[PDB]
Design an enzyme around this catalytic site. Structure first.
Site, PDB file in Angstrom:
ATOM      1  N   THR A 151       0.464   7.019   7.791  1.00 39.25           N
ATOM      2  CA  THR A 151       1.282   8.215   7.913  1.00 39.25           C
ATOM      3  C   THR A 151       2.062   8.165   9.223  1.00 39.25           C
ATOM      4  O   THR A 151       1.756   7.369  10.112  1.00 39.25           O
ATOM      5  CB  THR A 151       0.418   9.488   7.889  1.00 39.25           C
ATOM      6  OG1 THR A 151       1.266  10.640   7.964  1.00 39.25           O
ATOM      7  CG2 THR A 151      -0.551   9.501   9.058  1.00 39.25           C
ATOM      8  N   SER A 152       3.076   9.012   9.334  1.00 40.14           N
ATOM      9  CA  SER A 152       3.904   9.063  10.531  1.00 40.14           C
ATOM     10  C   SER A 152       3.179   9.766  11.680  1.00 40.14           C
ATOM     11  O   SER A 152       2.507  10.781  11.481  1.00 40.14           O
ATOM     12  CB  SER A 152       5.216   9.785  10.215  1.00 40.14           C
ATOM     13  OG  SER A 152       6.005   9.965  11.375  1.00 40.14           O
ATOM     14  N   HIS A 175      -1.526   4.066  15.555  1.00 39.93           N
ATOM     15  CA  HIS A 175      -2.756   4.157  14.788  1.00 39.93           C
ATOM     16  C   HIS A 175      -3.633   3.000  15.235  1.00 39.93           C
ATOM     17  O   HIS A 175      -3.141   2.025  15.807  1.00 39.93           O
ATOM     18  CB  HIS A 175      -2.467   4.024  13.281  1.00 39.93           C
ATOM     19  CG  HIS A 175      -1.804   5.221  12.674  1.00 39.93           C
ATOM     20  ND1 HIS A 175      -2.368   6.478  12.703  1.00 39.93           N
ATOM     21  CD2 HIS A 175      -0.639   5.347  11.995  1.00 39.93           C
ATOM     22  CE1 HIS A 175      -1.579   7.327  12.069  1.00 39.93           C
ATOM     23  NE2 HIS A 175      -0.522   6.666  11.628  1.00 39.93           N
ATOM     24  N   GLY A 176      -4.930   3.114  14.973  1.00 41.75           N
ATOM     25  CA  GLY A 176      -5.842   2.051  15.340  1.00 41.75           C
ATOM     26  C   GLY A 176      -7.223   2.196  14.733  1.00 41.75           C
ATOM     27  O   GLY A 176      -7.510   3.167  14.036  1.00 41.75           O
ATOM     28  N   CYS A 180      -6.797   5.498  17.512  1.00 41.87           N
ATOM     29  CA  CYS A 180      -8.131   5.686  16.956  1.00 41.87           C
ATOM     30  C   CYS A 180      -8.994   4.454  17.204  1.00 41.87           C
ATOM     31  O   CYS A 180      -8.482   3.340  17.344  1.00 41.87           O
ATOM     32  CB  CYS A 180      -8.058   5.926  15.443  1.00 41.87           C
ATOM     33  SG  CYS A 180      -7.003   7.294  14.935  1.00 41.87           S
TER      34      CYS A 180
END
Lengths: 232, 232
Positions: B28-29, B87-88, B129
């Site tokens: 997601t953005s 993200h991660g 994350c």
């Protein structure tokens, strides 16, 4: 911005010293570990911690020991300290008859499972391998995981060196620095000098070129929310 | 016991800002991330760092970018900073079209691969994350891995929160604390206040009880061998 360290007692300092491991593990003996346990016991004694030394514990004894400690009333205690000395791998420490997950150990003290320590510094000092890699050197509410401090002897994935005569590089340095700066410096600064001492003063010597001329750097992992001073 | 920060230049501050991800990832953005990038850019500008902002980079562009940066001459630079925003998962950060291992990123700067930075502080600030877990809250030579500092937005295995309007909890706090204490406090102490700010001032609000009333605590990971001050 500084933890309240004026409670009636400084707190407990649990030291688990595993030297001999069950033949059913293939684990070699950790020679010279007694020097660390003794050095740590005395070092923390001077800081006014209630020290408890346990030797050669099994994976189950360790888990149970932590469980009973977390079930105690730490109301009059300013903090909690636990030192783990033995073999290990990334994320785990070895009992006398098998590996134990470090998270299972620390979870007993989460801000929601040990209310008598909520808001108080929880220090875990780990002298144990985090892998087999070797350094060749060069040249309102609060989170349940908050207020924890993990002082690792080596960086993730790396082996942890120990001198069978003088003790592990990490513990030697940690005690020396505590003994010299505990009455002045803040904990993180003390641990930073520990990082430099081990980084600059130690290097391996081995007839086996594969383990010769290696270096080590500790790993400070902090979830603390305030400065920590071992004095009022 | 203090890093030399009087070199001609403070150093580079590489900011990778990944907002939009390839539809082929399902990611997601990351709305509101631009606020972090802009906040970080200005915050480090005031600290005299040479800031470089890169947006929506692919896993390959990121790797290559780090490679070229490590191949530069950092002789006149006091340090190096890199901020990752995206993200991660535990141990990885997501490029625009796929996941990237954090170790591969940091390895380019090892004490033996980037000689112009050997002995100099290498700071990696990761807003990403480290898993999906949520906090419910409560109440001579040197090692090649030495002189690194990893400032994680959350503890291992935990999700990292972000306000689509004000930016991520971590970055908001980090910049505010830098802006207020960079001319006085040592870096670890500054980051400790960041830990308390995020821990005490932030809590999630969601119509979805599964993501409501959650907390967060950052994770300071230090392999530094000296105290760090963003001034002479």
């Amino acid at each position: 911005n500084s933890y309240k360290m004026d409670y009636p007692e400084m707190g407990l300092c649990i030291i688990i010293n595993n030297k001999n491991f069950h033949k059913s593990t293939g684990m070699t003996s950790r020679s010279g570990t007694d020097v660390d346990a003794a050095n740590l016991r005395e070092t923390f004694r001077n800081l006014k911690y209630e020290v408890r030394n346990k030797n050669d514990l099994t994976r189950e004894e360790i888990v149970e020991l932590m469980r009973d400690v977390s079930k105690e009333d730490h109301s009059k205690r300013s903090s909690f300290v636990c030192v783990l000395l033995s073999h290990g791998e990334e994320g785990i420490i070895f009992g006398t008859n098998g590996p134990v997950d470090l998270k299972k150990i620390t979870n007993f003290f989460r801000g929601d499972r040990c209310r008598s320590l909520t808001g108080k510094p929880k220090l875990f000092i780990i002298q144990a391998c985090r892998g087999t890699e070797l350094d060749c050197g060069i040249e309102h509410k609060i989170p349940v995981d908050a207020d924890f401090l993990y002082a690792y002897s080596t960086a993730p994935g790396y082996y942890s060196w120990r001198n069978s005569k003088d003790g592990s590089w990490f513990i030697q340095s940690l005690c020396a620095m505590l003994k010299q700066y505990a009455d002045k410096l803040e904990f993180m600064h003390i641990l930073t000098r520990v990082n430099r001492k081990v980084a600059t003063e130690f290097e391996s010597f081995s007839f086996d070129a594969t383990f010769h001329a290696k270096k080590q750097i500790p790993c400070i992992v902090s979830m603390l929310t305030k400065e920590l001073y071992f004095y009022h």
